[PDB]
Structure formats: C-alpha cells, structure tokens
Amino acid sequence: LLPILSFPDPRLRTIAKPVEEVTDEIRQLAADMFETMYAAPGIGLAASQVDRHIQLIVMDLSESKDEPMVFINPKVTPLTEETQPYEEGCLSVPQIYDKVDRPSRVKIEAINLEGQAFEIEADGLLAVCIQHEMDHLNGKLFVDYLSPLKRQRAREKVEKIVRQREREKVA
Numbered sequence: 001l002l003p004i005l006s007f008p009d010p011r012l013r014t015i016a017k018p019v020e021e022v023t024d025e026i027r028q029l030a031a032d033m034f035e036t037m038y039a040a041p042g043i044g045l046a047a048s049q050v051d052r053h054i055q056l057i058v059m060d061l062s063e064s065k066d067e068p069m070v071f072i073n074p075k076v077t078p079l080t081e082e083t084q085p086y087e088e089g090c091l092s093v094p095q096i097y098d099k100v101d102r103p104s105r106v107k108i109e110a111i112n113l114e115g116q117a118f119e120i121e122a123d124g125l126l127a128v129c130i131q132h133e134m135d136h137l138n139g140k141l142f143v144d145y146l147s148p149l150k151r152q153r154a155r156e157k158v159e160k161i162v163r164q165r166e167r168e169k170v171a
C-alpha cells in the first residue's frame, strides 16, 4: 500500500506532468494505486495523492469493486453550464465531506494502460469523480471550493485524524 498525502501537505499543490510512455513502471504504479484505493477504501485516486506527480488517475465507481478504470493524460471538457451538487470526499482530506457544484456532463479524452486513446461522455458520478481527480493533477483540492472557515475546520480535523492514525500504529 502506497502512503496517501494528507491536506495541508504542500506536495498536493504540485501540477502533474503528462506521462510520456505507458511503461511497465506506470503499469505497476497503477496496480499499487488500485490496491491503496480499494484498501482505503475509495472510488478514485490521483497519482499526485501518492506523491507521484504524473497525469495518472485510477477509479472504480462499483459496489463490487470490479469495474476498474484508468485515465492517463486526461482532458476533461464540460458539455453544459448546468451543474449538479454532490457531497464529495477525498482520501487526501480523510473523513471530510461537503457539497461541491460541478458541470453535470463532460467529455473525457485519455489513454488507457495499453497506450490506446479513448473518448467518452460522462454524467452523474463519473462526471463528478473525473473532475475531482483532474483537479488533483492541477494541484487543487475539493476544500478550495469551500468557505475559508470550512477549510480551516477541515485542516484542524484532518490533523487530529492523522495524529490518531499514527497513535493506532504505536498501540
């Protein structure tokens, strides 16, 4: 399991570089990212979150944890001004959730682990999650859309959760 960076770690603000070739090393990273993400458990993880500053996102929106998806060098284009409220969380802002409004339909262009390009249209949870994970690659967290008090309260509660997770390793 890869360690996940926690807000307010400044390495989460890093702007990810495009992946130049889908090597067997980015394939193993993807594999390690899925295990880390499934174990958390979470439905998405950006390579930025495990301190690997490259345009790689893993995701699995299924209950069964058996619909895995990879997005490498993604471009996300909204297809509407209409937004959709969603209560977002983030493995890098542990146990914090709040409402974010994002465009409700998007185009995703990305490459898969075979280096093949694809283009799909996303709504509902896929649209929410791809935009959340694209934000990570541009050094942005979902708490940047909240009021500063909400951000400060998130920061203070995450620092407490992280301290408790360290104490749990000593016990």
Ligand SMILES: O=C(O)C[C@@H](Cc1ccccc1)[C@H](O)SCc1ccccc1
Binding pocket: 041, 042, 043, 044, 045, 046, 049, 086, 087, 088, 089, 090, 091, 092, 128, 129, 132, 133, 136
């Ligand atoms: O760590 C991340 O970046 C992934 C977030 C993605 C997310 C996007 C939109 C809304 C909520 C979360 C994690 O998946 S949050 C953990 C989680 C686990 C099970 C079900 C829902 C959320």
Ligand SMILES: [Zn+2]
Binding pocket: 089, 090, 091, 092, 132, 133, 136
């Ligand atoms: Zn996140």
